[PDB]
Structure formats: C-alpha cells, structure tokens
Design a protein around this ligand. Sequence first.
Ligand code: HEM
Length: 188
Amino acid sequence: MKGTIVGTWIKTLRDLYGNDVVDESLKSVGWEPDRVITPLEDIDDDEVRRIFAKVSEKTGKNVNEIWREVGRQNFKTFSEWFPSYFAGRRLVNFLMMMDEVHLQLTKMIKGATPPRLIAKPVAKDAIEMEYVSKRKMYDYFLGFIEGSSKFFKEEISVEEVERGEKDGFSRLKVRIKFKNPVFEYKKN
Ligand code: HEM
C-alpha cells in the first residue's frame, strides 16, 4: 500500500480514537509511534491489517466498523492533503472520474494498485458505482463514498445492491441517488 493513503489512515485513526490507541497499535507492529510516512514509500498490507486489529482490540470495536468510520473521516483527511483531485464543482462528475483517476495511478505510480470504480448513470438522479478489487475493503469503500457527500456538500443516499467474490476479485455495486437530478436524457 502506498504511503499516501496509509499516512492518511494513521492521522484519521488519531482523530477518531486518539493518540494512545494509535501509538500502541503502531508500536505493536514495530513502528515508531511518531513515524513520518512519506507519500511514495510502500507499506506492507499485512502491517496495516495488524495495526487495525490492534485498534479494534483496544476500542472494542469490530474492525469492519472501524473501517466504515475511517472511510467517512478519511475523505476529509485525504482531500486536505491531496487537494488537486478534489477541486471539481459537482460530486457526480467527481464520482464518474474516479475510475480513470485510479487507473492513472496504477499506470504511473510504482507499487500502486487502487481498485476499479466503474460508474454508470442509471436514472436522472442516480449512478451505479462498482468497486472491484483484489483487496476487500467493502466498509472503507462505503464510508469514503459517504465522506465525499459531506465534502461536496451534496446530499445522497447510498444503497448497496450487489456484493460477492468472483475469480479472485471482491465486488460491491452501490446505487448512489442524489436529492436533486443530475442527468437528462439526450438522443443518441
Ligand atoms: C469517491 C472517491 C474514491 C473512492 C471511492 C476510492 C476508493 C479506494 C479504496 C476503497 C481504496 C483501497 C484499496 C482497495 O480497497 O482496493 C483505494 C486506494 C487508493 N486510492 Fe482511492 N478512492 C477515491 C478517490 C481517490 C482519489 C481522488 C485519489 C487521488 C490520488 C485516490 C488514490 C488512491 C491511492 C493512492 C490508493 C492506494 C493504492 C495502493 O496503495 O495500491 N483515491 N481507493
């Protein structure tokens, strides 16, 4: 996992559960509690997993619930640190651009393998987005979408319609519905 994202996870964990929970969790995997994570270094996926398991242990929270909360709050943490990607006007266009943004990172950044996020308009007020990953971060994905709403200041409802694993991939399709319409039909 790239330092960019893991660094935001560590800060977000602190904002949610405080410095002691985090310091101990990092110490438990052999990090300095005050480790400065750089954007382009690589962090072992399993060390992140063990860190989050420690947070779970020390907070009595299910890890999936932690990931859900981290997702929501991390949208803020991440958008503040990497603003270039979060300056658009409309949530819907942001969401539609995400598959290409991730694809560009896969292409151009060594060691980066973000998930597919193919989005598809399905109604004048809704899009379908499908998370497809070799990882499985269903709850983080859900929380991050929810965090995007608070940032663009646009109300949405997020409805999960499909979940499952096939051929090595975790897959989660959500239907994102906007209070106010965002598409109109146009002749082919
Ligand atoms: C609503 C918008 C977004 C969603 C839903 C989303 C979703 C995710 C998720 C769930 C992961 C965890 C990896 C996985 O589960 O497979 C991930 C990884 C990542 N994402 Fe995003 N993302 C969004 C926007 C962005 C933006 C704007 C950037 C700008 C650089 C970005 C950069 C990254 C990076 C660098 C990783 C780590 C990839 C790796 O370490 O292999 N994401 N994304």
